[PDB]
Structures are given as structure tokens and as C-alpha cells.
Design a binder for this molecule. Sequence first.
Ligand SMILES: COc1cccc(OC)c1-c1cc(C(=O)N[C@]2(C(=O)O)[C@@H]3C[C@H]4C[C@H](C[C@@H]2C4)C3)nn1-c1ccnc2cc(Cl)ccc12
Length: 441
Amino acid sequence: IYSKVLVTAIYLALFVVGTVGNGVTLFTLARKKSLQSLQSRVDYYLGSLALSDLLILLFALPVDLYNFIWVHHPWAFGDAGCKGYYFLREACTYATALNVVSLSVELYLAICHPFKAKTLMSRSRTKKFISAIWLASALLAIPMLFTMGLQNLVCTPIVDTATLRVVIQLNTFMSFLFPMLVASILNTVAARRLTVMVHPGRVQALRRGVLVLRAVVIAFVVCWLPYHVRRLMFVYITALFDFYHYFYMLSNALVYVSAAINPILYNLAEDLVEDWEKARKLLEAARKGQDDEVRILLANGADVNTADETGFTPLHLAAWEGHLGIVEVLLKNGADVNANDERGHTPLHLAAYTGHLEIVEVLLKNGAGVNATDVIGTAPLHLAAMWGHLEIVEVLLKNGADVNAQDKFGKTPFDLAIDNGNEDIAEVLQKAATRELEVLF
Ligand SMILES: COc1cccc(OC)c1-c1cc(C(=O)N[C@]2(C(=O)O)[C@@H]3C[C@H]4C[C@H](C[C@@H]2C4)C3)nn1-c1ccnc2cc(Cl)ccc12
């Protein structure tokens, strides 16, 4: 009896947040206009999946909560509500299945037949086609009007178990399993081709669409499998009989919980990957040298102080690749000049390494740590003397570089200069050293 309240509270909560959630999602994707066509066509399929979820929450859930609340009470929705409850529930399972299949085809064609896709696909055609999806869904659901009926009050099948075993089997085959098999094959083949095509506005959309499709396909199996499993049992199939009763109950809730959380989830997940893509784009743009792309991303709201798995900020990559323009703009939008990575390298280490003179100047001008030492004990002057960048050694020494600094290997930059046959560079450190001796006295 106590559980009834607990289930009610949970079931009511799922209803209000589920209806409003899917409603907001429906109204949002409606207003939403994207320049990339596929972005739109993806959102059309995401609309009809939110509609399918909303219908089930408005029409089906309330009937269940009554069936749960009033156990073994008369069916109080008439023969119309009886036949209709299963029509809508069957009409939505088809709609969802045809959407995830239609979406996966459009996204397969995009990647694997682009110059066949360009000549076939359009926002208008997708919109007109998603109508056909809901028609087919309604026509495929018509048989459930005749299978279910009212008797003595129970909304129970009004047809033989033989004829009923057929429809349940035909339902589960192409409202599930067929879509699952088609979605996973097409999305796999496409995703493999996509990761190869990497090894532009349209190309961005594809990576988004493939993520979306893998997210909805995983969300589709977790929700509808225990349900369709439960259905499949009726067709084929004690003390555990009462224990297998819990599965039936658990499978219903799952369809509802999923349908209610998916909007709250998708939006939560979209935000994270939305920024994760911006940050990933900035790092690529910085290292590549697309000074244009960087400008756009920083305005968009990309994190100036992003990092790699290694701990390479954009300023590390720009300084390393020697993109003075990108270095200048990164510092302009408040990049950490003294930022460290795993090995403990600052940008000034990398600009002294590759030997970009003016970047070394800019980093120091914007307050770079001149003596900054890494894990191995190495400093920027070690690296300039190592590669023999005489001009960089000059400015480093000029900006208060420690000519004496030794590493873990017990080698100073003076030694490294000699050890690389850099006769000129070595001569400058000797001069610099004896000057430091005289001020020390
Ligand atoms: C022989 O059936 C099973 C055997 C083993 C496990 C089962 O479910 C966990 C089932 C099963 C499936 C359905 C099952 O899927 N009913 C429906 C439903 O979804 O509500 C009903 C009946 C038809 C038309 C329509 C849609 C389908 C199939 C309404 N109902 N159902 C059950 C039938 C009879 N007694 C059961 C007792 C227990 Cl403890 C659990 C399940 C039972």
C-alpha cells in the first residue's frame, strides 16, 4: 500500500517533467534554424522522437497509473479507451523505429554517397517524408484496434492466441530488431568511413549527426529492449513466476522514465560536447596555423586555456609551430604565458626549441618565466644553446637568463653549446658568465 504512493509520486513526477521537457524540445527545434542542411534534417528526426515520447506520456502513462493505483478494478476508459490505448502505444513504437532508420540512412548516404546524397536530399523532402513515417505508423497500428477489446471489466485480447502471436511477432520484428540491425550496420559503415575521411561546415555537421545517431540508437535499445523482450516472452512462454512478474512492471516504467529524462539528458550531454568540440577545434586551429579559425572560436566562447592529454595549451602549439599571429591573439584573450604541461614545459621552452625569435620576444614581453625549469631540470637557455639559436640566447640572457643553471644530467647551457659544436653560441655564454662574475665580485 505504502509503495503505491511512492510509485504515484515517481509516476506523477515523470509526467510533469516529461511532458514539459519534450514540449520545450519540440518548440526549441522548431524555431532553431541552421545554415548546414543536415543539421536541420537531423533536428526534424529529433523532433518526431520527442513527439513520440510526449504522446506516450500524455495518453498512455495516465491509463497505467490508474491500472497501478486501482488493481483488479473495472476498466474505466470504455471499449474506445481500451482499443485506443494500444493503438497509440503501437503507433509510437513504429514512428520511433522508422525515424531512427530514416535518420541512419540520410546520415549513411551523406558520408558514403555524398554526390548521390546532394542530388537526392533536401529539408523539404525530409519534412514531407517524416509525415509518411507518421502515416505508416498510424496504418501499422490499425490492427491493434481489432486485437484488444473489453470483457467481463478487462481490456483483454478479443482474438485467438495464434492470430495474436503473429501481430506481436510482426510488431517486434520491424518496430525493433530490424531498425536496431539496420541502424547499427549503416552507422558503423558510415562512422568507419568518417574517421578515415578525417585521415568543412558540412563535415562539422556529419561528426555531430553521427554522435546524435549513436546516442539515440543506444537510448532506443536500453528503453525498448526489456519491453520488446517482455512482449517476445508472451509469444513463446512456479516460484519464480511471481519474480518474473517484476520484469513486466519494470519494463513499462523504463519506457516512461527514459521518455521523461531523455530531454533533460540530451540537453545536458549536448552542452558538454558542444564546448568539448569548440576546445578541440581551437587546439587543432592553433597547431595547424588557421589564424582565421582561431579568431572565430575565441569570439564563439572557446576556452583560451584549453589543454591536451599531454597538457599542451593552444599557446604551447602556436609557439611550437611558430604561428606568431596566433601567439599574439591568444595572449590578447588572456592565455597563461607561464602555463605548464606533463613534462613541465612552458610556451617559452617550445619557442626557444624550434627557435622562433619574435615569439620568444612576445612571450617575455607578456611576462614569460625566463629561468622556468621542467621536470628533467632543463630551461629555455639550455634549448637555444642546444639547437644553437645565437639571437635567442642574446635576448634570453638580456631578459635575465641564468647562464649557470644545470639540469638533472649535470650539464649547463655552456656545456650543451660545446657538445653540439656551436662555436659562436658557446663564445657568448663565456662572455656573459665572466660579466656575472664581476658584478658578483
Ligand atoms: C506468457 O507471457 C509471459 C511469459 C513470461 C514473461 C512475461 O512477461 C514478463 C509474459 C508476458 C508478456 C505479456 C505482455 O506483453 N502483455 C501485453 C502487455 O504488454 O501488456 C498485453 C497482452 C498482449 C497484448 C498487449 C501487449 C502485450 C501482449 C497487452 N504478458 N505476459 C504475462 C502473461 C500472463 N501472465 C503473466 C504473469 C507475469 Cl508475473 C508476468 C507476465 C505475464
